[model samples]
Target: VFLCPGLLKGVYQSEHLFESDHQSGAWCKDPLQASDKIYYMPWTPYRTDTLTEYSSKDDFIAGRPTTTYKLPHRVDGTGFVVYDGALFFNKERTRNIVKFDLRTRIKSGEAIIANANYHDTSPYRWGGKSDIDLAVDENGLWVIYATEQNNGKIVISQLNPYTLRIEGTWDTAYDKRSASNAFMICGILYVVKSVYEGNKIDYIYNTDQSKDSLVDVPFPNSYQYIAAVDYNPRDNLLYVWNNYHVVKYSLDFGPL
Candidate 1:
């Protein structure tokens, strides 16, 4: 499956605040300027409670942490995934990944699984891991992140929750380009590199199985970043959504 980075703070906090205050352009409130301080962190007070208020087709994303944590590094746009009842997320600015139990959702406190030790990187030549997308499989959850300081490099990795280590790393062939979206399909990974005008490239790969095997897709101009990628266990079909469109593909590869 695939995921999207949550550009939440952007909707609330903004560049204006940073330019006026922060020296590096990364600004944050001291006491946390949340709309409601009581409901912070994983607790989202904006979640819809009724049918009429269901999620919209064009509306921004729903369900996100309301906490106003400090951003010392460059981390923003929090993306997360849950596997085996444990939740994994990236530290706000640093490369560290944060782990917490599902139960911790209700009871608030510092029960973090500690920094998983493995952290993403940042480079002036290649994009960093500040913004990341996530996916999961039987083996474990994977992280897809990009860097803007450099040219726009994307990194894909299989992260070990227990040890907090990023075991497998895959740097797409077009490492210099910016990656807008990624998701695993039929045991293979697919990525879309973003560009201006009609310049866009979609790639399919399985770095763990075979680096030589890959396919290029002609989904350009219309498609934006990978909005979401999901596998329906019931139908065994892969669903993909870009910013403007959604489609499904059936993996007809027979079993070995």
Candidate 2:
């Protein structure tokens, strides 16, 4: 269990499952709240401007979406996330991260991840327009992508959720195409080996300190074509979008 916060100490098993039947998309709720509503981008690969808002998780699993909204801009990839009542997504074909306010039904904020490559130049191993991944963890908003300046390695940037401005960044040695996907916890980076049979959480890079490295952890991708994995700090759960299936995984630290 996550007895503390700010960054993830480690990862554990896949606790349970959830809804959906899409090859690539993002499913999540506000990481700061315990809400019944689930905001889902049904198919990033198919439709990127519409979001299916489910009244509850059960409603989500039962194919009952309360209200669907057409986002002001098209979401580019599978790394989009719902956090603090806003949809943070990559604006199609660009390096800009746009925050769409669910309440206002309009654009709230936007900022460019300068120097971050987009347009399939450097995307996740699975590739669903996943060039620039947006995530929110215990520490807050983060951008995980690659840069040509850094030799196509993974570059981690901390963002101000409200302003969408890059506060700080860390250039890690991990290759973006070398992993299937990646997520953050308390500023720590966990890289999934690949979305395949018998895969593992191949590496852990602590933003607090890069000296801490390569603590291999086990992770499951049951659906085989697992597209994206975003962590919800509030529930200690991983909101996953596997190929044609949506699932959730509980984060477990080793036994005390």
Candidate 3:
């Protein structure tokens, strides 16, 4: 288990079951306070499973003493963001945004979103298809989705996590295919260009000065085969992980 100190402070590990073509089991958490807990989802091909296991930071890292629960509905091949006991995610290959209640293990609500596609394949690999990118912050839930009907453009939307309802939408100039992963920090949308060979990441930051304009952010690293990258506000670092390793890069937020 690798531990990182950030706004989302916790240990993360990629546990593979049998070496398939996708990710196995993944987990995450916030700071380990009395109210802190870790969420774990095992990799299932169908995305029809509603199971989510959770435990305290100590027991979770020790690999024992955990409890599991069910989501309101099954979901597969979807991105998710958990905040304040609610799990917001896409529903399978559909544009349905599902809001799940962690405290009750039930659904708060669900709504169909437009202009998005979904696939079970890797977003960065060949024959890949991606539908929705989900994220959250202290503000609320946000989504970066792709639309083929709109000339294959990428769109960002802010939604109420409890209702799965869109609050506002922004049409980005970014091509969805160019991003490896995306997230929300302080209510702004950002994308990280896929990096297959080098340590420097080409990042596109959506700034307040120009909503439609994208500012380039330089991200330096030493890892290759980057699979995922996300910002952690606790330590103000970018957490990146590949098939075998995880690394954090100090983010300089002064430029943009």
Candidate 4:
């Protein structure tokens, strides 16, 4: 969750430098300058929807923080991403999609959609909560959800950051939870099924050619827990955040 520090309005802890206590959350960066100020959203137990700002190098290495802000409403799901000065996230139980304005520290817009989980299991099933997944790419923000209307097919939508309106939508015959982590690259949605009993990690793509196409993402060392995957458009690299360290993989787009 990358954000401009100017939006925080100088609400930070000067004494509490180089120390953060967020358990689980999403993070992003500006990529151009090494401002040393990174944005973070901690998703721990009994946590509320909020964004925090921390310094780079020291604060990120030490998991420390400088300031935090309370979003307009609580985001109960992990489907959250920061782009273009706004926070797009699932509005509790997949009932709505909400955007939190970083400048005003309030919810600027929302979209209500019927999200039904046909199965009882999900990526975040341990918490017994299910919601649409969110992703970002070179184009803009996206909303990924499953609907009973299509007999449990996944639906992806391109969203307008400013107006918070749905620009367009695409449906695929893929099961949502089949992948441990999902992301958007070049307007196409990709899902990664973490290495479990199988020795190799699997990559699934939802595209027009094939609904759910399978591919292999090679890694030198076997990783058990894959927390998240993000594609850096500038560097043209895929970053996989596993247990403790980040593994970078150079991507090659061939004939598909």
What are the RMSDs of all candidates, in order? 12.4, 2.6, 6.0, 8.5
Cα TM-score per model: 0.48, 0.91, 0.73, 0.72
Q: Considering TM-score, which of the candidate structures 1 and 3 is the better prediction for this target? A: 3
Which regions of candidate 4 are displaced past 4 Å? 1-24, 30-36, 114-130, 196-212, 219-223, 237-252
Candidate 4 to truth, TM: 0.72
- lDDT per residue (tens digit) for residues 60-141 in model 2: 7787889998888787778888877888888888899988888888898889999998968788887777899887777788
| Comparing 2 and 4 on TM-score, the stronger one | 2
Question: Model 4, 50-73: lDDT tens per residue?
Answer: 777766746766767776877766
Q: Write the per-residue lDDT of candidate 1 for residues 163-233, one digit (tens) a residue.
A: 67677766555442345445554345655555422322355556656453334454332333343343333
Candidate 3 overall lDDT versus native: 0.54
Query: Which whole-number lDDT from 0 to 100 does residue 250 have in model 4?
Result: 54
TM-score, model 3 to reference: 0.73
Top TM-score prediction, candidate number: 2
- lDDT for model 4, please: 0.55
Report how far residue 129 has shifted in candidate 1, in Å.
8.4
